[PDB]
């Protein structure tokens, strides 16, 4: 299928090139260099075709990934293959850097020859049997990303959470695991949708499997309803003639008072013609940065069911006042030690029928780490 | 942080 496969750096030169078919020529890589890196027409599509020649491009670190073919293949498979190539590169030599790429010629050549022939991608499959641990221990990490579009009128415009499971098991033998959570859909939550690892067996739906060795992701899931909102933002904008704006932003901690927030980031929008801003903060530190048109107020810790606010004076430069300032939404970035979804783990039944040790020998470790995704409050 | 399950 795939013939030539070429990679660039930010400087634009060819780094490593191999072609599996007679169809691809140097003209392809040259046109890719000229028409992507050297072409100033930025607006494009992630794929392109010139003179019946398909070009595939993606940028990571400062490295271009170029794939070229003649036929009507499926894009997704090739893209997955490219992601796999990049990921195995990162695994083999950590950070992806130009010299780091360079010092691996034999690795590159042997991998491309093995993993890929003539454009065809070549490559219990998750855990062996000889794994032993006298200290049967497992760790649970609950990672959830909160997404909110918040209206100036006090209604949630959109809300949805992307959640993934991260677990670190160290157990002897071939443990048989049954995951128990409030899947009643009294504690109960509803799973909007979910995708799993290969080890998960379909047969409330519970998860029965033998976990892979070490750290792995059991399942991928999405939640959209009944999401606990971490924060509430109260916008207030006042215009003062043609020289000043009076904007005071209030934020509500929508979680338990016993919970302390960490690394609170609030980005307050200001116009480009802002002549200056005076910062007032009772908690943390507040800064004004005229460059990117933002007011930086950071709160180290601030408890739930509580409130914090910033008093700001936004001094405007007189300008073409007829075209009014279109207010961007108020964005906040934060990390919470709880899951906004509300998931509750009933149990994790892990049993080893083969070896003569009980479930009490397992040290099961659980923690919640919530992250902010897109959290914007329109004003 | 991690809590005993």
């Amino acid at each position: 299928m795939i013939g030539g496969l070429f990679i660039y750096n930010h400087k634009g030169e060819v780094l490593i090139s191999r072609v599996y078919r007679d169809d691809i020529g140097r003209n392809a890589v040259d046109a890719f260099r000229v028409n992507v890196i050297h072409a100033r027409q930025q607006v494009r599509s992630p794929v392109t075709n010139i003179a019946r020649t398909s070009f595939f491009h993606v940028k990571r670190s400062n490295i271009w990934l170029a794939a070229v073919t003649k036929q009507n293949v499926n894009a997704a498979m090739v893209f997955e293959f490219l992601y796999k190539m990049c990921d195995v590169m990162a695994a083999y030599f950590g950070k992806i850097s130009e010299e780091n790429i360079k010092n691996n010629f034999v690795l590159i050549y042997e991998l491309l020859d093995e993993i890929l022939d003539f454009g065809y991608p070549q490559n219990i499959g998750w855990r062996r049997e000889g794994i032993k641990y006298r200290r049967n221990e497992l760790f649970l990490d609950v990672l959830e990303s909160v997404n909110l579009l918040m209206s100036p009128q006090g209604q949630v415009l959109s809300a949805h959470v992307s959640g993934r499971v991260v677990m670190k098991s160290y157990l002897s033998g071939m443990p048989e695991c049954k995951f128990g959570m409030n899947d009643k859909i009294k504690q109960s939550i509803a799973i909007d949708d979910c995708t799993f690892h290969q080890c998960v067996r379909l047969s409330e739906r519970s998860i029965s499997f033998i976990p892979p060795d070490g750290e792995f992701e059991l399942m991928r899931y999405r939640t959209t309803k009944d999401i606990i909102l971490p924060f509430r933002v109260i916008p207030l904008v006042r215009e003062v003639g043609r020289t000043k704006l009076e904007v005071k932003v209030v934020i509500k901690s929508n979680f338990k008072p016993s919970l302390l927030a960490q690394k609170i980031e609030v980005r307050i929008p200001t116009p480009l013609n802002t002549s200056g801003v005076q910062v007032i903060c009772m908690k943390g530190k507040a800064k004004y940065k005229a460059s990117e048109n933002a007011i930086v107020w950071k709160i180290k810790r601030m408890a739930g069911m509580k409130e914090s606010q910033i008093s700001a004076e936004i001094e405007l430069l007189p300008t073409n006042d007829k075209k009014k300032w279109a207010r961007p939404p108020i964005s906040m970035n934060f990390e919470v030690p709880f899951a906004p979804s509300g998931l509750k783990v009933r149990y994790l039944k892990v049993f080893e029928p083969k070896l003569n040790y009980s479930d009490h020998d397992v040290i099961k470790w659980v923690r919640y780490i919530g992250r902010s995704g897109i959290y914007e409050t329109r004003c | 942080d991690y809590q005993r399950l």
């Binding site: 200290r135 049967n136 009980s358 009490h360 020998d361 040290i363 | -």
Partner: protein, 142 residues
């Protein structure tokens, strides 16, 4: 009779010491450092019997733990070694998994157990099952 009881790690951090007679703190702590020095230099292939000045120490290992026992000159040592072994057995069967974190977080439980079968410098209870029964009944009520 038993002078005092020590449980120490490789570094020497003091998690437990228990005395029976009047003793000052400075001499207690210094005794801690030199007994640490004596115990830490040994290994598996040495007899667990040591004599220093007017006292003798029994000290058996578990993974990375130093369990040090101070008694008088004429007591029956290996009997105390068996007692310590049974102590470790009952502590292991208590948690279904024994670890340092159990000592860190169940220090009052350890206090109650040692009081339940170590008092006034002598063995108080030797039967494992009765200790377990007493533990179950006393853990029940608040």
């Amino acid at each position: 009779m038993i002078r005092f009881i020590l449980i120490q790690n490789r570094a020497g951090k003091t998690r437990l010491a228990k005395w029976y007679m009047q003793f000052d703190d400075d001499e207690k702590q210094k005794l801690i450092e030199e007994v640490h020095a004596v115990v830490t230099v040994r290994d598996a292939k040495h007899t667990n019997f040591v004599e220093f000045r007017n006292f003798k120490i029994i000290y058996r290992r578990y993974a990375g733990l130093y369990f040090c026992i101070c008694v008088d000159v004429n007591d029956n040592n290996l009997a105390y070694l068996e007692a310590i072994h049974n102590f470790v057995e009952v502590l292991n069967e208590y948690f279904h998994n024994v670890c340092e974190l159990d000592l860190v977080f169940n220090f009052y439980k350890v206090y109650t157990v040692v009081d339940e079968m170590f008092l006034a410098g002598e063995i108080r209870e030797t039967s494992q099952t009765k200790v377990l029964k007493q533990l179950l009944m006393l853990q029940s009520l608040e």
